[PDB]
Amino acid sequence: KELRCQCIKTYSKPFHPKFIKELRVIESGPHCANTEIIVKLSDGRELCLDPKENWVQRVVEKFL
Amino acid sequence: AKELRCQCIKTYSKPFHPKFIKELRVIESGPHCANTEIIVKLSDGRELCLDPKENWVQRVVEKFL
Amino acid sequence: EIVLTQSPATLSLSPGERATLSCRASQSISNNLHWYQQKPGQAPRLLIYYTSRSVSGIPARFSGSGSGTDFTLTISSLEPEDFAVYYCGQNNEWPEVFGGGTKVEIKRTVAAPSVFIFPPSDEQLKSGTASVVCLLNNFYPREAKVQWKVDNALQSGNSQESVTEQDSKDSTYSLSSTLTLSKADYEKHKVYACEVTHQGLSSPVTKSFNRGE
Amino acid sequence: EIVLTQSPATLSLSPGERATLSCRASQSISNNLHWYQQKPGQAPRLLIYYTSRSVSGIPARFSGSGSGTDFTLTISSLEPEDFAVYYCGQNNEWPEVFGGGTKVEIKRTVAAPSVFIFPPSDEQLKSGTASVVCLLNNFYPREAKVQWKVDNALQSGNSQESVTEQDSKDSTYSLSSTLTLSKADYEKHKVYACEVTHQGLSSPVTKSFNRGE
Amino acid sequence: QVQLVQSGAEVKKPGASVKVSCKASGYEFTSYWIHWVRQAPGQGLEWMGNISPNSGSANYNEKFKSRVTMTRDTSTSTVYMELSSLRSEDTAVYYCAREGPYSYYPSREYYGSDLWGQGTLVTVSSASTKGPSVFPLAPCSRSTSESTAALGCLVKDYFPEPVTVSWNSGALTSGVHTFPAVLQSSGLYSLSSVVTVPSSSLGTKTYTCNVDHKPSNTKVDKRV
Amino acid sequence: QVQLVQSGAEVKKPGASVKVSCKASGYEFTSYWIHWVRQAPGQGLEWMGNISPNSGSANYNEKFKSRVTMTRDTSTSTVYMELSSLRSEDTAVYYCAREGPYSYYPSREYYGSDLWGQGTLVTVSSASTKGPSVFPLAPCSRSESTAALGCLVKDYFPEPVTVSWNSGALTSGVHTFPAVLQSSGLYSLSSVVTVPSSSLGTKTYTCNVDHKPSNTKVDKRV
């Protein structure tokens, strides 16, 4: 359960969606005023992505 | 946080409004699960398995922003 | 909401003694409980973070521990600069919540106050208001009851108290209580009294004057 | 890889006694540890799931407990139907991993075996091979040493043992040891002996025959 | 009748393939995972993998992933396991087992495998079907001071398992010990069956062992 | 020099708005959350909300969401808090505080607020600048070994007032009390001194009162 915002900063360098093993979209709620995006990489590292960036919007729109 | 096995044997089949989805989680197939899985968190806090092969589910993901 | 309950409200200890401060969370906050020190006229200062983790620049005498919803700050041996207010603060969830604070004060022997009453001044009386001041001088402990009696009638809601910080030299407190009454109301009565109840006083002490005398 | 270590490999207990079986996980498996019973020639059977949870149709004498990576299955009082092999199995992660199993065997009084030797048959001897069989009948405990001596020469690597399951009526074991030699090798010697060492035997017991009798 | 019914025993040559079935009955097929667990003779339990009966999406143990396939047929509520490039080490009883019930609500608290099939013996061997040779087991001298005597039958060189043994067409059961088979360096099985009888009854009473090896259609009665 | 520097004290009328700033220096601005915590006189700490310095996306305490706005200016490493529809109850020292460092790798183990600004006093009052009136505090009868005298510094605005005795020569036995906010919206304080009874008549006692906002300088012998 999301108790506060997870992402203070976001990874800005675009990359190919093939390296994303898990995509997590968290809608704004009582504990965070903004939509947040967390992707999990092959290594298991969790990365914050900017939902306001077009390249991120495209990875979500074509993720299936 | 780490996926150790498949979490979804069955999926919720009744389409519902995406407005009830507070969290969307897409899990790609890996060493511990052979298929893509979709888990959604509802307003009440309940987690639900959705079928990635169903068109209505594909649309909620494609139009989630 | 998360409610953090600190106990006790005041810790009265001598320098060199061990201070044990408790914080109870209404619900689980994982280990995201932090400890702050605040001195008069200053901003709070972080001592311990994530229940037990050490903060750069903070003396080793400060340590934190936590079992479920129960948290503890320990000061192994109190130094003179350690006498301050301490707050616990959670940030496991937003809104961040702080406890009500625990004051760590210097323990000393009981000292009865020296009570004095001051009638209003003629120069003030000319302006249409009357202030009657009662002073409690150099007492310990802090707990003191001041009762204003205007012709044996107990007053309430018409007075304001003010307390000093614990004296650096004798560790006592001093208090001023001011009764505000219009010139009209003030001139309608005779005996103005200030009754003081304090641990140092075997029986309450009354200080009074008669208007005009 | 998750490795589940069960101890001991064998528990020898009397009916009515308490059986405590241990399972140690190499890493945390949360509480997703389950216990199975397996009898000879049958499929495993679930007893306890999720460390301590009860399974429909399983007697109340079975209970499970777990502290971190340490798990325990307790059979409060052993009944005849409880003497079997027990496996712990985790499914917190895939691949599912099972422990090596703990055999729960009936402890009874010491019973010396009845020993018998059987020479090869002429019909077998015609085929170019000779099998000499030694039989240990109705003994307890299971541990028995069988030495084949061909003209006082200790044999090794040319015999195979076979043990029955613990008898349902007297709780003993029976064992057969077979010495395989070619007709050529067999005809080159006289005294064929089988020496048996067992707790029930004050001194070893030898059974022999001479080839040609 | 809640059941998991497996296909019969299989005998395969190295390099060959085997396909074992598991038919589910009397429950909601799609609510339970179907696991395959094998048990090599005298050994423990080893997870092959599983399959979701709903999707047909199978999960494999990395150890067998290159040669194992799991499929399902929702029409007949049947699950299959195909194991290829067979080696001697694959000789085991293969069990199917169910784990559930689960729904569309994910969880981190699991059930154990509450129902198991009867198992399927898969024998992987270069050896070819062979009936046994039966030899008597009698003392050297029928001369005995002792009250009890022993006789038996040695059932040698058969392939595959099993062999059934009775004494006096089933009339004699008391004092009988039929030992488990042993696998010889030759690739063939061998066992003994013995009986403890009174010494006085020798000469008067007859002792015949009845040996049946159904895979080669061998039936043998041997008086000892 | 790692710092959080806040704008100066503010005096606002009820219904008005206040905007307080917090300038960050000597560290990576984007790695730390900036929280706003207020402290009403003699009270505890209350979280108002925060803001990410990267997104400029603010999180508020439900209690103030209708009246509070938090913004940031990455160019000047400054965070702002605007509080509207001010009422007497908003009179508090408002602090900004940093929590971090964090990056684009999320965590559930948090740091405390390790650096705090000096605070900004916001006073919500109907009153306008007013110099104090100074009255003596003397017993009714000038007749015990110890006696007390003092000065009552009444009806001023805004704070502070400085008080010394005998131009700083007298410090022993002096108690200058913290100011009290009267129902009138004006401040008032007392400063007292205990002295020996014998020294009355011989020794002189004068309070020196300064109130720089209204340029009031008063010396009163009591």
Coil, strand or helix at F139: coil
Q: Looking at the complex, does the CB of residue C93 fall below 8 Å from at least one CB of chain A? A: yes
Does C136 lie in the same domain as C94? no
* B to D contact (≥3 Cβ pairs closer than 8 Å): yes
Q: Do D178 and E133 touch (CB under 8 A)?
A: no
Does D101 lie in the same domain as D191? no
Nearest by CB to residue A60, choosing from B1, B58, B64, is B64
Contacts of B25 in chain A (CB under 8 A): 22-25
Cα separation, C173 vs C186, in Å, equals 30
Q: Do F106 and A9 touch (CB under 8 A)?
A: no
Q: Are F34 and F53 in contact (CB under 8 A)?
A: yes
Helix (H) or strand (E) holding D49: strand D45-49
> DSSP assignment of chain E, as one string?
--EEEEPPPEEE-TT--EEEEEEEESS-GGGSEEEEEEE-TT---EEEEEE-TTT--EEE-TTTTTTEEEEEETTTTEEEEEE-S--GGG-EEEEEEEE----SS--S----EEEE---EEEEE-S---B--EEEEE--S-S--SSSEEEEEEEEEEEBSS--EEEEGGGTB-TTEEEPPPEE-TTS-EEEEEEEEEESTTBTTB--EEEEEEGGGTEEEEEE-
Contacts of E92 in chain D (CB under 8 A): none
Cα separation, E69 vs E19, in Å, equals 9
* CATH code of the domain covering residue C172: 2.60.40.10
Q: Which of C164, C106, C119, C159 is nearest to C137 (CA)?
A: C164
Burial (Cβ within 10 Å: 0-12, 13-18, ≥19) of residue E75: exposed
Given resolution (angstroms): 2.3
Does D190 lie in the same domain as D157? yes
Joined tokens for residue F148: 């007390």
Q: Do F59 and A33 touch (CB under 8 A)?
A: yes
Contacts of D94 in chain B (CB under 8 A): 4-5, 32
Domains in chain E with CATH codes:
3-124 (2.60.40.10), 133-223 (2.60.40.10)
Residue A55 Cα, gap to closest chain B Cα (Å): 12
Nearest by CB to residue F194, choosing from C30, C114, C164, is C114
Joined tokens for residue E97: 């087992």
What is chain C's length?
A: 213
Does C153 lie in the same domain as C97? no
Does C72 lie in the same domain as C139? no
**Which chains neighbour A (Cβ–Cβ under 8 Å, 3 or more pairs)?**
B, C, F
Contacts of E106 in chain B (CB under 8 A): 7-8, 39, 47-49
Cα separation, F163 vs F175, in Å, equals 10
Q: Looking at the complex, does the CB of residue B4 fall below 8 Å from at least one CB of chain D? A: yes
Residue type, F135: F
**Which chains neighbour F (Cβ–Cβ under 8 Å, 3 or more pairs)?**
A, C
Q: Do F175 and C174 touch (CB under 8 A)?
A: yes
Nearest by CB to residue A47, choosing from F52, F57, F105, is F105
Q: Which domain holds residue C150?
A: 114-210
Does C125 lie in the same domain as C190? yes
Does C20 lie in the same domain as C73? yes
Which residues, at least 6 apart from E39, have a Cβ–Cβ distance to it below 8 Å? E45, E46, E92, E93, E95, E119
Number of domains in chain C: 2
Joined tokens for residue D99: 């422990």
Of D84, D106, D128, the last residue of a domain is: D106
Q: How far is CA F12 from CA D29, F7, F179, in A?
A: 61, 15, 19
* Beta-carbon pairs below 8 A across chains A and F: 46
* Beta-carbon pairs below 8 A across chains B and E: 45
Q: Looking at the complex, does the CB of residue B2 fall below 8 Å from at least one CB of chain E? A: no
Of D106, D140, D157, the last residue of a domain is: D106
Of D61, D88, D106, the last residue of a domain is: D106
Does D128 lie in the same domain as D88? no
In chain C, what is the straight-line distance between the N-terminal and C-terminal CA atoms, in Å? 58
